[PDB]
């Protein structure tokens, strides 16, 4: 009910954010970075010029998903 015509899938948001591929660091970790790309587009949509944003990470977040 919140997002009628907007997509369900975080797959559609991976088109919008590049991840430099040294960050792909676990077996589910491609599928987890999509939700990061999925939500911040929907969260910050009133401040979206139509630029493409890029993801940087804390190294503990790299360290936590290794496991």
């Amino acid at each position: 009910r919140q997002l009628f015509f907007l997509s369900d899938n975080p797959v559609s948001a991976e088109r919008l954010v590049r991840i430099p591929p040294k960050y792909y660091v676990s077996t589910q970790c491609r599928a987890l970075y999509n939700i990061f790309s999925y939500l911040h587009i929907l969260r910050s949509i009133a401040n979206n010029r139509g630029k493409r944003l890029k993801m940087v990470l804390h190294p503990g977040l790299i360290a936590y998903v290794r496991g």
Binding site: P21, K22, Y24, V25, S26, T27, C29, R30
Partner: protein
């Protein structure tokens, strides 16, 4: 004095560290891109 090996190595260690010959860094690169995630290599990435 069989501890004389401790003297000669400590001088030889003191030359290597003074040459600035190897500086360690905190970036692993044991695997290429898209091999640590990869589920088929899960038996290999644990042994490395």
């Amino acid at each position: 004095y069989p501890r004389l090996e401790g003297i000669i190595v400590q001088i030889n260690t003191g030359y290597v560290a003074s040459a600035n010959v190897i500086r360690p860094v905190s970036e692993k690169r044991y695997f290429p891109e898209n091999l640590e995630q990869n589920q088929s290599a899960a038996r290999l990435v644990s042994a490395v």
